[PDB]
Design a protein around this ligand. Structure first.
Ligand SMILES: Nc1nc2oc3ccc(C4CCS(=O)(=O)CC4)cc3c(=O)c2cc1C(=O)O
Length: 602
């Protein structure tokens, strides 16, 4: 049994979204077989619907045609089918439980901004913009494409009794959670939800009531679990904070919103890894800005002075001209960035993350309880699987940066030998050319000064070959410990966690299907119970392997890194002083090579 039309037909089982106005079915065309989104209304239109046909944009679901059903003669809308679901469906997956991927987040912001701007150029107010009103289509290039279509938690404080729901959506897509949540959720604590919005804190964007009828934990920054880069949070926070307060006097409006959002999307990314702080970063800088502004953003994200920023890329030093535009910088990835080191001693911090534990599993056979329990616990393992791959990246980036920096130091040492041979040759060809010619005080004073030079020049040679003995294998500065301390891709730790993650996701997706069915049979009930216990042994087995292998080896590698940083900073100061002791005596032998060697006489 199913409904049909002159051109389309759809089954009642293939139902997608179910709402108050109408329901949307997955239907096909009678002549082509192509799939469409059929909207059948449960219950002026012929003009306001044909004006939505001509609406053609990448970020808007195309309304193809309007046909009338066969049996009920209901107005049926034929719309573009988006097989991936809505943004809410995307945010339901455990990998996005603590926030969208950073690249995926930019696609959402681009399509959402690009879609509403085309609707404002035509004059359509969306009123309600939630992850449910944002569909997802896979483009011809494999990247997601988000589209608006349909035009309690996403309401303005005055409407609770336009840019608001956009700020709630972007915060939801960035943290994996809502900005304003009471204790028992926005249900019976609905009056608390309104008291949270009317608190008008302005600068703050979050309000978490972690106790029943307790306080409201405000914050102006993103949570630690945010999977966006710290450079992206700095540019995102003021956009939300200025669109999340009831004051129209203090509201931004679309023009300042569209301007500041277009500013973010037009910035390219320069990947930088602070080798001394063991921190990776992303610099959002416009392609027309100069490298001076680039060093400014690095200082605002690492507190390293701009003049002290020494850059390494692909095994060599990197000199940035202060006027060199950002679009001419070398292309960088998260795995091949620009290592920044500084002569000033820096604190070794490492990666900062929110340390979460497994929530306990209840024995109550609750199809809704087990589902909401399985969703949070699988998102925790994803976060632990996320941090595990980040710690592995930090360690492998550390090994390349250290294995490079020792070659850059050995390059500064080899340049010092070049200036040493230039002084030794000058010394010998000037201390012996005097012996050839050899009124006595004018010559004996030279040898009491030429022999002081060759003596202090020799002490440089001894303290140089000492550094050459330190930059040798096993010379109290070898990078061999980096390969024998932390975790490696050979251990395959990220994949070992990904194995237990898929089993927990398959159990979650099954419990998500078990909740749709109102009740289960006796046989299916015991499978829902047996796999609910396996969900605990997988999460417990993963958290054991995560903390007792990934974290321990990481903190052992980091602790060994902080010591090696000091021993490296120590050797750099010596080699710098030893080279400065070569330049000032390269010119001290210049005061005597032309002095007495060239007397005056006709
Ligand atoms: N044009 C539209 N195309 C739509 O395609 C959809 C395709 C798939 C799904 C499901 C995938 C897996 S799942 O787990 O079952 C969750 C939902 C939902 C939709 C959907 O809701 C939808 C709405 C519209 C609209 O215009 O409202």
């Amino acid at each position: 049994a199913m409904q049909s039309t002159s051109n389309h037909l759809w089954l009642l089982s293939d139902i997608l979204g179910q709402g108050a106005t109408a329901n949307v079915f997955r239907g096909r065309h009678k002549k082509t077989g192509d799939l469409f989104a059929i909207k059948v209304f449960n219950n002026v239109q012929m003009r306001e619907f044909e004006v939505l046909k001509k609406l053609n944009h990448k970020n808007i679901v195309k309304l193809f045609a309007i046909e009338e059903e066969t049996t009920t003669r209901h107005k049926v809308l034929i719309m573009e089918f988006c097989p991936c679901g809505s943004l809410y469906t995307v945010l339901e997956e455990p990998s996005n439980a603590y926030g969208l991927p950073e690249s995926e987040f930019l696609i959402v912001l681009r399509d959402v901004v690009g879609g509403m701007n085309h609707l404002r150029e035509n004059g359509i107010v969306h009123r309600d913009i939630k992850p449910g009103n944002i569909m997802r289509v896979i483009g011809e290039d494999g990247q997601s494409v988000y589209k608006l279509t349909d035009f309690e938690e996403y309401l303005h404080p005055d409407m609770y009794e336009d840019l608001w729901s956009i700020g709630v959506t972007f915060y939801h897509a960035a943290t994996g959670s809502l900005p304003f949540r009471p204790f028992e959720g926005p249900r019976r604590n609905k009056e608390v939800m309104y008291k949270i919005i009317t608190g008008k804190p302005s600068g703050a964007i979050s309000g978490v009531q972690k106790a029943e009828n307790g306080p409201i934990d405000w914050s102006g920054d993103m949570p630690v679990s945010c999977s966006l880069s710290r450079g992206l949070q700095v540019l995102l926070t003021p956009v939300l904070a200025n669109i999340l307060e009831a004051d129209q006097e203090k509201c931004w409006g679309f023009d300042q919103f569209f301007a500041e959002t277009s500013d973010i999307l037009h910035r390219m990314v320069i990947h930088v890894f602070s080798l001394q702080q063991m921190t990776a970063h992303k610099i959002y800088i416009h392609s027309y800005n100069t490298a001076t502004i680039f060093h400014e953003l690095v200082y605002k994200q690492t507190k390293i002075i701009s003049s002290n920023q020494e850059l390494i890329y692909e095994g060599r030093r990197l000199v940035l001209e202060p006027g060199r535009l950002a679009q001419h910088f070398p292309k960088t990835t998260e795995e091949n960035p620009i290592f920044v080191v500084s002569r000033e001693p820096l604190n070794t911090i490492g990666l900062i993350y929110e340390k979460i534990s497994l929530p306990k599993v209840h024995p109550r056979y609750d199809l809704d309880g087990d589902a909401s329990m399985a969703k949070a616990i699988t998102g925790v393992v994803c976060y632990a699987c996320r941090i595990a791959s980040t710690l592995l990246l930090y360690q492998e980036l550390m090994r390349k940066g250290i294995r490079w920096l020792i070659e850059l130091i050995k390059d500064d040492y080899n340049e010092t030998v070049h200036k040493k041979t230039e002084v030794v040759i000058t010394l010998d060809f000037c201390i012996r050319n005097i012996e050839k010619t050899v009124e006595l005080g004018e010559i004996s004073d030279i040898h009491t000064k030429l022999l002081r030079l060759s003596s202090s020049q020799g002490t440089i040679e001894t303290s140089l070959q000492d550094i050459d003995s330190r930059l040798s294998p096993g010379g109290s500065l070898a990078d061999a410990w980096a390969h024998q301390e932390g975790t490696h891709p050979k251990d395959r730790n990220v994949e070992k966690l990904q194995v237990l993650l898929n089993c927990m996701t398959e159990i979650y997706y099954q419990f998500k299907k078990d909740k749709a069915e109102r009740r289960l049979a006796y046989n299916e009930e015991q499978i829902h119970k047996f796999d609910k216990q396996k969900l605990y042994y997988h999460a417990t087995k993963a958290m054991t392997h995560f903390t007792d292998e990934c974290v321990k080896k990481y903190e052992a590698f980091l602790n060994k890194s902080e010591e090696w940083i000091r021993k490296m900073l120590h050797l750099r100061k010596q080699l710098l002083s030893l080279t400065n002791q070569c330049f000032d005596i390269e010119e001290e032998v210049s005061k005597y090579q032309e002095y007495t060697n060239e007397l005056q006489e006709t």
